[PDB]
Short mmCIF file of C-alpha atoms and ligand atoms in Angstrom, two decimals:
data_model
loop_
_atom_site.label_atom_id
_atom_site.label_comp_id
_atom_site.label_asym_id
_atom_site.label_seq_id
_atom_site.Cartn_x
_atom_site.Cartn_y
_atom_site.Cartn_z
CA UNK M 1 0.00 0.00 0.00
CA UNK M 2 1.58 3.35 -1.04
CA UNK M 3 0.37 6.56 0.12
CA UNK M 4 -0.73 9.68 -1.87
CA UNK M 5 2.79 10.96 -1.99
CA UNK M 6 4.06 7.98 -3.43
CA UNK M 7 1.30 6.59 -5.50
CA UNK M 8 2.15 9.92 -7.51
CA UNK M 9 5.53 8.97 -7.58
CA UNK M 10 4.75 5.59 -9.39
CA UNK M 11 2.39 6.57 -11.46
CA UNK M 12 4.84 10.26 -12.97
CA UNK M 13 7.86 6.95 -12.99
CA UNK M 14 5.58 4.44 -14.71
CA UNK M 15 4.22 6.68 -17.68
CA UNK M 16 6.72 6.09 -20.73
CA UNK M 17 7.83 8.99 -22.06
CA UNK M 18 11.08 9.41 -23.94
CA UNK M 19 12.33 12.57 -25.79
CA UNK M 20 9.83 13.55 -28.72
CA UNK M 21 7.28 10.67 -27.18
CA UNK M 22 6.23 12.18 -23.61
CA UNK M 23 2.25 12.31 -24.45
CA UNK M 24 1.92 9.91 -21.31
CA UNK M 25 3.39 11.01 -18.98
CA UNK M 26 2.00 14.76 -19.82
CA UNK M 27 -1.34 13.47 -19.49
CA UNK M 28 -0.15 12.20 -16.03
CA UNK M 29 1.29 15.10 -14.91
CA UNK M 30 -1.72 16.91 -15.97
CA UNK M 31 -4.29 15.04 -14.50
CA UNK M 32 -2.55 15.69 -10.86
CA UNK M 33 -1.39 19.37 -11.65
CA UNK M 34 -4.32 21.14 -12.82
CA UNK M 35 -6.34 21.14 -9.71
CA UNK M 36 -4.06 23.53 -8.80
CA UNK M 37 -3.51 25.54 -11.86
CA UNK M 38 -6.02 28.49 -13.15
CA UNK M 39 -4.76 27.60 -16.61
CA UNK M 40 -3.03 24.60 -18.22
CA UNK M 41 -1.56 25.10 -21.85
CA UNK M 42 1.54 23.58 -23.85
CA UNK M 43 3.91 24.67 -26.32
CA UNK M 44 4.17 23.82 -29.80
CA UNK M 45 6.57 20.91 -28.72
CA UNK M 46 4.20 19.31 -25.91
CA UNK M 47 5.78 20.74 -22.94
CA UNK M 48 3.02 21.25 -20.13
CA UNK M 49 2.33 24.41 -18.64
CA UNK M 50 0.23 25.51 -15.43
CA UNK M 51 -0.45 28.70 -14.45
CA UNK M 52 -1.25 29.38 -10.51
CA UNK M 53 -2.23 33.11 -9.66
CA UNK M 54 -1.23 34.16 -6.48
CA UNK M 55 -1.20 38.40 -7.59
CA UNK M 56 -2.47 39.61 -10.89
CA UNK M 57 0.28 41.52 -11.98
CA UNK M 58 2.92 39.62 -9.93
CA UNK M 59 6.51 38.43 -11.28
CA UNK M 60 6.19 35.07 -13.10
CA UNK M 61 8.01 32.58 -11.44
CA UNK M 62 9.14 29.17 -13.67
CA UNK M 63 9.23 25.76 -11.87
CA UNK M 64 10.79 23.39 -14.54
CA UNK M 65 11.12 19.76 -14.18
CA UNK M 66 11.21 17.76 -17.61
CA UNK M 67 8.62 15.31 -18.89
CA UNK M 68 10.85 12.84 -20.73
CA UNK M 69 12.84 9.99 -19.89
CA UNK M 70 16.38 8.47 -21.68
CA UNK M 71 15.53 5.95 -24.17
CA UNK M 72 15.79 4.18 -27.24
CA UNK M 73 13.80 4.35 -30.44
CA UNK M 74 13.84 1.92 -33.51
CA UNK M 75 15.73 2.32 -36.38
CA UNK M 76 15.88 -0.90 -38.18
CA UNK M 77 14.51 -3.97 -38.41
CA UNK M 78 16.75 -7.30 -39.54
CA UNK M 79 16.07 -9.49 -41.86
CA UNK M 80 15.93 -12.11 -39.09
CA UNK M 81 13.70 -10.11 -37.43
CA UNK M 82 15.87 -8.22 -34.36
CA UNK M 83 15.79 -4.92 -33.70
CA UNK M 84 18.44 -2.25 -34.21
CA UNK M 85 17.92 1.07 -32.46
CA UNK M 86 19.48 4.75 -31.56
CA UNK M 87 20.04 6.06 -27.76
CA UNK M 88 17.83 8.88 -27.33
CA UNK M 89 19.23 10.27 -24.36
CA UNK M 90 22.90 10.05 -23.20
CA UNK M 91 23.38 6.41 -21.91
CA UNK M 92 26.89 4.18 -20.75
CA UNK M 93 26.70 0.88 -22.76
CA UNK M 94 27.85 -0.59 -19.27
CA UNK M 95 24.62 -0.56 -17.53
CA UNK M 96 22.02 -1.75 -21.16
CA UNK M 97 23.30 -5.86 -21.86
CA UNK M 98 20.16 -8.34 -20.44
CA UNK M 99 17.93 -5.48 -19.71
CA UNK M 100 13.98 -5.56 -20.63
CA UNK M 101 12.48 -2.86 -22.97
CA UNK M 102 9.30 -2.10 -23.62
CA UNK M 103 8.79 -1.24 -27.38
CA UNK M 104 5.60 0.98 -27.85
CA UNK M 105 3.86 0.65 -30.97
CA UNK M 106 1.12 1.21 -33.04
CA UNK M 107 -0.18 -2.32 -32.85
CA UNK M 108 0.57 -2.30 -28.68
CA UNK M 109 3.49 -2.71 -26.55
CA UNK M 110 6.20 -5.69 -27.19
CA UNK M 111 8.60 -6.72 -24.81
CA UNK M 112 12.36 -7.30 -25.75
CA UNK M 113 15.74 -7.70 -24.52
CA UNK M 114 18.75 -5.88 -24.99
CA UNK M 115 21.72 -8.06 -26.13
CA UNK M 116 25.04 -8.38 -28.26
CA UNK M 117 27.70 -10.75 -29.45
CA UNK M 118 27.90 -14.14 -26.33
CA UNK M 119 31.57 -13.57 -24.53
CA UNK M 120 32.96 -16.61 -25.33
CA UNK M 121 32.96 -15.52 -29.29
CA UNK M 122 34.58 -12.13 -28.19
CA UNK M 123 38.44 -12.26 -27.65
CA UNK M 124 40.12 -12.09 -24.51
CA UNK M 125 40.70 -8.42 -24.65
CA UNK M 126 37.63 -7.46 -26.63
CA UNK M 127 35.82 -9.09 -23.34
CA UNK M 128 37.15 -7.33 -21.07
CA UNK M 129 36.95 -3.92 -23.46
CA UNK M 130 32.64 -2.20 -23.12
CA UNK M 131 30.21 -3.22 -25.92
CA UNK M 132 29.68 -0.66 -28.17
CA UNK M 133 26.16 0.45 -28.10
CA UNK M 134 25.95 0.85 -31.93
CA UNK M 135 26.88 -3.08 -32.00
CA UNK M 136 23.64 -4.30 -29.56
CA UNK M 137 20.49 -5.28 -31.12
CA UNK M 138 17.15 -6.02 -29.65
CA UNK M 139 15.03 -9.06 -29.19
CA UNK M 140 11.39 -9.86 -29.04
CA UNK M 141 11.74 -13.48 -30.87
CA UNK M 142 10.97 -12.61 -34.07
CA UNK M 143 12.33 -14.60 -36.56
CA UNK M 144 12.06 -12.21 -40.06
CA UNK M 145 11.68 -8.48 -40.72
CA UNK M 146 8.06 -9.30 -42.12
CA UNK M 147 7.10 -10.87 -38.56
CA UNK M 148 8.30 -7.88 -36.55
CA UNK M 149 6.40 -5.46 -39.26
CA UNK M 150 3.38 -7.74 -38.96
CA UNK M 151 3.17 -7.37 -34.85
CA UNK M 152 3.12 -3.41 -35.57
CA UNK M 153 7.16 -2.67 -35.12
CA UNK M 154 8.27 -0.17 -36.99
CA UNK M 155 11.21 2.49 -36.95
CA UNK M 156 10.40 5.31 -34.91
CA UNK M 157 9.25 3.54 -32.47
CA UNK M 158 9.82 4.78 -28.67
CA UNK M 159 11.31 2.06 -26.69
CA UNK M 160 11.34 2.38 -22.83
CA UNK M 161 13.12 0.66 -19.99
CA UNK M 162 11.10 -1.56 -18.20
CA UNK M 163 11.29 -1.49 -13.97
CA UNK M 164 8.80 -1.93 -11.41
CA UNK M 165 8.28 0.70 -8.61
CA UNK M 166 9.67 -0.74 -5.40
CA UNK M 167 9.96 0.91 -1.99
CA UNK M 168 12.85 -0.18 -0.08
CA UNK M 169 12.88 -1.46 3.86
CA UNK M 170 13.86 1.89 4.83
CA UNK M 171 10.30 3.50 2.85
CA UNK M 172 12.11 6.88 2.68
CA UNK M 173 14.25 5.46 -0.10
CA UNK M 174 12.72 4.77 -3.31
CA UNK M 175 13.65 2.64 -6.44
CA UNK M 176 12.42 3.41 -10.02
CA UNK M 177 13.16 4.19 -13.33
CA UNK M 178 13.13 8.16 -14.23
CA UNK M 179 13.59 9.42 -11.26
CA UNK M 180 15.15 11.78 -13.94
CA UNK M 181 13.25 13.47 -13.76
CA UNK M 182 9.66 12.42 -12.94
CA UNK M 183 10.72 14.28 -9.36
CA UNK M 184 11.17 17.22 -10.49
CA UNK M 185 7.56 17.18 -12.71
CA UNK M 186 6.70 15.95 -8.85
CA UNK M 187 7.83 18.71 -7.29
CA UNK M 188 6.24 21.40 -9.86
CA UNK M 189 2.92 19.42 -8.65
CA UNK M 190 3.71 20.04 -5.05
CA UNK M 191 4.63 23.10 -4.79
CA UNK M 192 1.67 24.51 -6.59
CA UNK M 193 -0.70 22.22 -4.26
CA UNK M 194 1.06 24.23 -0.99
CA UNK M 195 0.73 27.19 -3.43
CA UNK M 196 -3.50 26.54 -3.29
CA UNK M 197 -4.02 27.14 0.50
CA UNK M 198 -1.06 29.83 1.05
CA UNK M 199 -0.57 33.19 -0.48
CA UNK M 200 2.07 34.58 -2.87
CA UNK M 201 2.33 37.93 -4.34
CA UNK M 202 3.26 36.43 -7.85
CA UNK M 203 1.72 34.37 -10.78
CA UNK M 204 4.12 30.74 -10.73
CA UNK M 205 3.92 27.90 -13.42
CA UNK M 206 4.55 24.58 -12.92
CA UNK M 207 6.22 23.18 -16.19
CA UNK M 208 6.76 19.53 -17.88
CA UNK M 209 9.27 20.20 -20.42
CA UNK M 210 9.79 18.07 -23.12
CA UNK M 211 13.47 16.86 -24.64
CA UNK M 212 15.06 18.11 -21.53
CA UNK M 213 17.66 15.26 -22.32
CA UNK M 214 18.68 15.89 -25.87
CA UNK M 215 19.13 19.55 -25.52
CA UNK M 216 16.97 21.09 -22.90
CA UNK M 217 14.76 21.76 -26.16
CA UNK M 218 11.34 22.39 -24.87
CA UNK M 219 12.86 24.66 -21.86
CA UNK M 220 13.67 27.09 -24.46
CA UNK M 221 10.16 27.09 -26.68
CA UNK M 222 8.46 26.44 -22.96
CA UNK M 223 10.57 29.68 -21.58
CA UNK M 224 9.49 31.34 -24.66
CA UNK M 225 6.18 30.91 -24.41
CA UNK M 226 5.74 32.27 -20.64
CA UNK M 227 8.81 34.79 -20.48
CA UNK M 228 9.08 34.58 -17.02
CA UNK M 229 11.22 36.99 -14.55
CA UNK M 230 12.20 34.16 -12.61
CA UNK M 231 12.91 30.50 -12.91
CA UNK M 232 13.77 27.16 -10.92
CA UNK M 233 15.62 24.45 -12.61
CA UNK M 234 14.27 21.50 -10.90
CA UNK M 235 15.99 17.80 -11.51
CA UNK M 236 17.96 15.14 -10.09
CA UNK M 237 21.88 15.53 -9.33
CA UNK M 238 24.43 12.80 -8.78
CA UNK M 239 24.64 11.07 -5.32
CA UNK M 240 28.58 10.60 -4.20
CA UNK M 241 27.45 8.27 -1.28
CA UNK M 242 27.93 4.99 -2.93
CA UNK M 243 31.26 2.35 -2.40
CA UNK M 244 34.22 3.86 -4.39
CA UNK M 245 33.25 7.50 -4.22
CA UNK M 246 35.57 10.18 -2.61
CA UNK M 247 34.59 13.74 -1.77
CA UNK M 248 36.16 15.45 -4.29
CA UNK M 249 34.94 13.50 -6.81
CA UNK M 250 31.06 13.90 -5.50
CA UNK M 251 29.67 15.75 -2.30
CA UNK M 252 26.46 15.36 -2.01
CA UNK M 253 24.87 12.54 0.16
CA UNK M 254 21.36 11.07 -0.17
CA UNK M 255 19.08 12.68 2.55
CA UNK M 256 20.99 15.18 3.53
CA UNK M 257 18.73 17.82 1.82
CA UNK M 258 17.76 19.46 -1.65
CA UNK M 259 21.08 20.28 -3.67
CA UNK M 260 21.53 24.62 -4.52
CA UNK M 261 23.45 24.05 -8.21
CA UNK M 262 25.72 26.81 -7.80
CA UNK M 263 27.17 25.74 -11.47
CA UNK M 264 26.96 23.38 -14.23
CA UNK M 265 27.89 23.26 -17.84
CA UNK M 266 24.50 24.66 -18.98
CA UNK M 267 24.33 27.82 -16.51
CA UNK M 268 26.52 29.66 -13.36
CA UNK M 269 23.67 30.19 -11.07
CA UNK M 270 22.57 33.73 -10.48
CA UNK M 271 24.03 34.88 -7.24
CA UNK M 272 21.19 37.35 -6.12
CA UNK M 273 18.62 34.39 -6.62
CA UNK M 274 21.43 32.05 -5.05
CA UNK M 275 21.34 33.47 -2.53
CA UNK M 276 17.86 34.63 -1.72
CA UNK M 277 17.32 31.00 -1.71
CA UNK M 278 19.93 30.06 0.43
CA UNK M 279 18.61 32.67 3.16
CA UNK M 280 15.20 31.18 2.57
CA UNK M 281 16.52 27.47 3.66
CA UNK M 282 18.29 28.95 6.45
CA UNK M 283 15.48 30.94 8.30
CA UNK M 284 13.22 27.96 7.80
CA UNK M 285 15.32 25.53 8.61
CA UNK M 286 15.55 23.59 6.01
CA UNK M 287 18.44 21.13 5.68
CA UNK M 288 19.84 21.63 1.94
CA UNK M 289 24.06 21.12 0.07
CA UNK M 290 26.01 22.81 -1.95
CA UNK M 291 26.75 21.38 -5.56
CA UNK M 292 28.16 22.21 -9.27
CA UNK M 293 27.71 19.45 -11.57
CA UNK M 294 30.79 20.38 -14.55
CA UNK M 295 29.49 18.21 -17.32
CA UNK M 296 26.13 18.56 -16.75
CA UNK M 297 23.04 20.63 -17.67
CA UNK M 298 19.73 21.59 -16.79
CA UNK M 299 16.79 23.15 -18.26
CA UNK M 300 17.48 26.37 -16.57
CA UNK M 301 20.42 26.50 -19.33
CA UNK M 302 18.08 26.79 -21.78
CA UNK M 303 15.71 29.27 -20.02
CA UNK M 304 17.57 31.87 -18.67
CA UNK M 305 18.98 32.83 -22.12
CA UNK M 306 15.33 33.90 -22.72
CA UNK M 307 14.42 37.24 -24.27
CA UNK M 308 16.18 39.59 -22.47
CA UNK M 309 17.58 37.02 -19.36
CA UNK M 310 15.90 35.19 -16.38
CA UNK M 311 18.02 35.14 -13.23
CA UNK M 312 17.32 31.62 -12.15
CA UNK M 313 18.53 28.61 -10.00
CA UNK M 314 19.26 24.85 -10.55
CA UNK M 315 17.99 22.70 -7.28
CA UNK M 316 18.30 19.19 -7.41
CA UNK M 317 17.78 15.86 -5.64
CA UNK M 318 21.02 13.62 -5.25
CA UNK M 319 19.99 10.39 -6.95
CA UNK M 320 21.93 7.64 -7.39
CA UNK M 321 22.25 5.40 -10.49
CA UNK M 322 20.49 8.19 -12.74
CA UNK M 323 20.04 7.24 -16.76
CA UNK M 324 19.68 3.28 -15.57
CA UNK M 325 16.58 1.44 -15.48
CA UNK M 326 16.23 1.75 -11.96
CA UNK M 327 17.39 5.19 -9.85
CA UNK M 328 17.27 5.38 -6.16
CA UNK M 329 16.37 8.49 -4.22
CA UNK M 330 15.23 9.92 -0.78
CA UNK M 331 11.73 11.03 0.03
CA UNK M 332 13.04 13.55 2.59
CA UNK M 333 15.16 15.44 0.20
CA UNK M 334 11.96 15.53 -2.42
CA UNK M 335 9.43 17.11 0.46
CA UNK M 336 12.52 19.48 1.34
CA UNK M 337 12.83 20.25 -2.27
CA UNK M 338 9.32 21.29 -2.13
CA UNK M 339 9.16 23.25 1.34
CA UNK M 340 12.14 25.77 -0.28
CA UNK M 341 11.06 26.62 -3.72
CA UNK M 342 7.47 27.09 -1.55
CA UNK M 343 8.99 29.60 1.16
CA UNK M 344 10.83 31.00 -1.63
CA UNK M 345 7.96 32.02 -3.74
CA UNK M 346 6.52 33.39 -0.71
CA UNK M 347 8.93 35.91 -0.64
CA UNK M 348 8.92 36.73 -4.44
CA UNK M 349 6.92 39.81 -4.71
CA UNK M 350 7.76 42.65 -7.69
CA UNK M 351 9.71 44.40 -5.68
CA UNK M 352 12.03 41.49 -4.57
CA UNK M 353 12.28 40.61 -8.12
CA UNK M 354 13.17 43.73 -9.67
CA UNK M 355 16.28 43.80 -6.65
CA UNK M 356 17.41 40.46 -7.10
CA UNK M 357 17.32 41.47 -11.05
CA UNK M 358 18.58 45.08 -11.62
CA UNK M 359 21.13 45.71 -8.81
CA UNK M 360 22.20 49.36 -9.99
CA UNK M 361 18.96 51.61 -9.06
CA UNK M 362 15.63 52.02 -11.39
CA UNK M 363 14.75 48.55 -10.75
CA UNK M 364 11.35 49.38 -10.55
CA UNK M 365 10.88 51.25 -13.86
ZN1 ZN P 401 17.34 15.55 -15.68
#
């Protein structure tokens, strides 16, 4: 039995939803957003946008999470009837041999299994060197291109990794595929639920963008399409907590709080907003860490370059084995997640903005 908290959780992490393909889990996110939204819309690209009111001609505050998932998608079908297919989504070929996808087509879903070349066939070296992803095929045990065609395959198809939802002894941690970043799409929800029975002198939107991981894509034509004044990045980061990982190399630990992104490769946080934030967590008490994540983005990359700039912040929940078929994360560091970005907005009136934005005088003009 899962509470309301977490039957949201599984339901965001079971929709299938990979970049270009995130109908699904859009309707999913919709169908538990909009009871707190005035307005839901989308861009021209399917991200999902709800509006929430707080003052009429209040600052408009972004919440982004993103709607899609890393996948696969067909490309070609063999003559013996496997299935040949491109990474949509950056993924290590160590972590794909003997998995189970889910192929979604038109015909209905078909279940297949990653594979490649046995080891014995491989030489010495060559077994000890990573599969290439380009040279892994898929199987559903079909047995000629014709077959595969016939049971509705075809390329284009989205495939999805398959995982079930599981809950751990210790129920605060959780274990389930997209945790990047069906969270974050979580925490949009949240925060505009606390935003229903609280009041906040700005207008916020909750956002679902799509192809967040082939180019934050729909941050920028989602960004476009609400030019807001301010805007939270929100997704998962990478835990450092596991066997074999040093400080330096990663920080952050699992339950230890909501990570403040002070850089990445997609954006150096904006320090007036950095640290509004950070005073926020402080005088509420809420427990949060420090983070930059150097080869990594976020779709705050994509929206701050919007029209004229949006100071914004990246806040993230340390999650460990992130662009696998099953990601493990803590509950406490999701509700704290959602407890900042709520004070926060609190706090966000016009005249806050225009500070934290012009910092030379005339702010207000
Ligand atoms: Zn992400």
């Amino acid at each position: 039995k899962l509470d309301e908290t977490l039957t949201m959780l599984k339901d965001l992490t079971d929709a299938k939803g990979i970049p270009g393909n995130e109908r699904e889990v859009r309707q999913v996110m919709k169908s538990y957003i909009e009871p707190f939204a005035d307005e839901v819309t989308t861009d021209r690209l399917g991200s999902l946008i709800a509006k929430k009111t707080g003052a009429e001609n209040g600052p408009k505050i972004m919440i982004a999470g993103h709607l899609d998932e890393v996948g696969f998608m067909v490309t070609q079908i063999t003559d013996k009837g496997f299935i040949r297919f491109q990474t949509v989504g950056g993924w290590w070929a160590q972590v794909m041999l003997a998995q189970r996808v889910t192929i979604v087509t038109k015909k209905g879903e078909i279940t297949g299994v990653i594979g490649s070349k046995p080891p014995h066939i491989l030489s010495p070296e060559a077994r000890k060197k990573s599969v290439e992803i380009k040279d892994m095929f898929i199987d559903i045990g079909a047995s000629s291109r014709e077959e595969a065609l016939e049971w509705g395959v075809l390329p284009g198809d989205m495939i999805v990794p398959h995982f079930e939802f599981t809950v751990m002894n210790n129920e605060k941690f959780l274990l389930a595929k997209a945790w990047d970043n069906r969270i974050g799409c979580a925490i949009a929800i949240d925060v505009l639920r606390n935003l229903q029975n609280t009041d906040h002198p700005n207008i916020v939107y909750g956002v679902g963008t799509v192809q967040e991981e082939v180019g934050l894509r729909g941050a920028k034509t989602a960004a476009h399409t609400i030019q807001p004044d301010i805007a939270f990045g929100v997704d998962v980061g990478i835990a450092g907590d596991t066997p074999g990982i040093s400080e330096k190399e990663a920080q952050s630990k699992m339950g230890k709080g909501p990570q403040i992104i002070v850089y990445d490769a997609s954006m150096v946080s904006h320090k007036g907003l950095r640290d509004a934030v950070v005073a926020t967590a402080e005088e509420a008490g809420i427990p949060y860490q420090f983070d930059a994540i150097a080869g990594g983005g976020t779709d705050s990359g994509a929206i701050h370059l919007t029209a004229n700039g949006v100071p914004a912040l990246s806040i993230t929940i340390a999650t460990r084995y992130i662009h696998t078929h099953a990601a493990m994360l803590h509950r406490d560091d999701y509700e704290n997640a959602v407890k900042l970005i709520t004070e926060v907005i609190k706090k966000l009136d016009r005249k806050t903005v225009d500070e934290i934005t012009y910092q030379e005088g005339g702010s207000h003009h």
